[PDB]
Amino acid sequence: DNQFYSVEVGDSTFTVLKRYQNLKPIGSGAQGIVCAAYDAVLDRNVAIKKLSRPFQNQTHAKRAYRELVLMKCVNHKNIISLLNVFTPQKTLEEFQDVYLVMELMDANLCQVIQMELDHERMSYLLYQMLCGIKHLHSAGIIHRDLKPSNIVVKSDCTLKILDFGLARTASFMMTPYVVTRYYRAPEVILGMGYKENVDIWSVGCIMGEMVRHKILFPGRDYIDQWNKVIEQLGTPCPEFMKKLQPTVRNYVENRPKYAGLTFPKLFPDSLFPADSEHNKLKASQARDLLSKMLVIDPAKRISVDDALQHPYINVWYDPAEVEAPPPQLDEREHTIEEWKELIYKEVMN
Numbered sequence: 064d065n066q067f068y069s070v071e072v073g074d075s076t077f078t079v080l081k082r083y084q085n086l087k088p089i090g091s092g093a094q095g096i097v098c099a100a101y102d103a104v105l106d107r108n109v110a111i112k113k114l115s116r117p118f119q120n121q122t123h124a125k126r127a128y129r130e131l132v133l134m135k136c137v138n139h140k141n142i143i144s145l146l147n148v149f150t151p152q153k154t155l156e157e158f159q160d161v162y163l164v165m166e167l168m169d170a171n172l173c174q175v176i177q178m179e180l181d182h183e184r185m186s187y188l189l190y191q192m193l194c195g196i197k198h199l200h201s202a203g204i205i206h207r208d209l210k211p212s213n214i215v216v217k218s219d220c221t222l223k224i225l226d227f228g229l230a231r232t233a234s235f236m237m238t239p240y241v242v243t244r245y246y247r248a249p250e251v252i253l254g255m256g257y258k259e260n261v262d263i264w265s266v267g268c269i270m271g272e273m274v275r276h277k278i279l280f281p282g283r284d285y286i287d288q289w290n291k292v293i294e295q296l297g298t299p300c301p302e303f304m305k306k307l308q309p310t311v312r313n314y315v316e317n318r319p320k321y322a323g324l325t326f327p328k329l330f331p332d333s334l335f336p337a338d339s340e341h342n343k344l345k346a347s348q349a350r351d352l353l354s355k356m357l358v359i360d361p362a363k364r365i366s367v368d369d370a371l372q373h374p375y376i377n378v379w380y381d382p383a384e385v386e387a388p389p390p391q392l393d394e395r396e397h398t399i400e401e402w403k404e405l406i407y408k409e410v411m412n
């Protein structure tokens with residue numbers, strides 16, 4: 064009779080459709096808790112994320128709504144695709160939670176970064192991240208907040224990006240969670256204005272960490288983080304400074320000057336499989352790509368198309384996956400009641 068059932072999953076109550084069985088916790092985040100499950104209807108394993116009262120505040124609401132909308136605008140093997148969306152609640156008045164269902168993956172990219180990976184695996188993960196970012200850019204979506212915790216992989220080395228990044232407008236959270244900012248581009252750190260290659264910096268940060276096994280640009284907030292960028296890469300050129308707002312420009316120019324380390328110093332041969340001649344050349348190509356991605360000035364940073372054509376990446380190139388047909392737009396402040404209805408009607412398509 065009742066098409067739903069409830070189970071306790073570490074404090075959280077998961078009320079799901081009876082087709083989803085044997086729920087087990089797999090992940091946590093600000094926006095929701097994630098379970099693995101067996102889908103008896105599709106006869107396959109799935110991941111179920113629970114969004115609890117996503118209309119409770121502006122931050123959760125914009126993100127929940129934006130991502131329910133954008134998932135219908137996108138169709139690419141390297142981007143999250145939903146198998147199902149549902150709410151156990153019967154009316155708008157009763158509405159509390161949203162459950163999102165996707166293919167069950169095997170790991171988060173944080174786990175993969177901790178491993179020693181050959182150049183075949185690393186170049187393939189990067190190629191897929193670039194394909195996913197290319198597809199998002201073609202659909203008018205510049206991410207600006209790509210990070211490993213929002214990227215998932217399968218044992219076969221296949222990869223998917225799980226989110227759509229930053230709102231095209233903007234904020235406060237009572238939740239004790241902290242937003243990971245270490246992969247953000249200088250144009251985001253310094254509130255500059257950006258183009259598609261803002262996402263290249265984030266790929267560079269991920270690639271760098273895969274090699275170094277340490278976050279490249281850590282820090283308590285943007286102050287410490289900027290210090291890390293300039294100490295390693297060196298103070299940017301005068302041409303860069305001109306594009307900064309006058310107040311951020313003053314702070315940036317009055318920071319201590321740094322020459323910055325060269326890329327062989329930043330990423331020595333020790334960090335690379337560089338035993339065979341094949342590995343020696345791939346190590347040289349990997350460092351070359353990193354030197355083109357970790358570039359402070361976006362005017363001098365490599366583009367998505369040029370990174371895809373890079374010798375380190377182009378061995379995976381296939382036209383069927385580099386280009387997919389790219390096909391209304393919300394940018395408004397709303398009350399709890401407004402967001403609850405906007406979300407509910409997206410859920411009830």
Ligand SMILES: Cc1cc(NC(=O)c2cccc(-n3cc(NC(=O)Nc4ccccc4)cn3)c2)ccn1
Pocket residue numbers: 089090097099108110111112143163164165166167168169170171215225
């Ligand atoms: C064969 C097998 C594999 C596993 N998998 C894991 O242990 C694992 C580990 C880390 C991440 C993931 N994973 C995380 C998602 N989705 C989301 O995080 N977020 C998300 C969900 C739904 C919609 C929108 C967004 C997908 N898989 C799985 C467990 C048991 N057996």
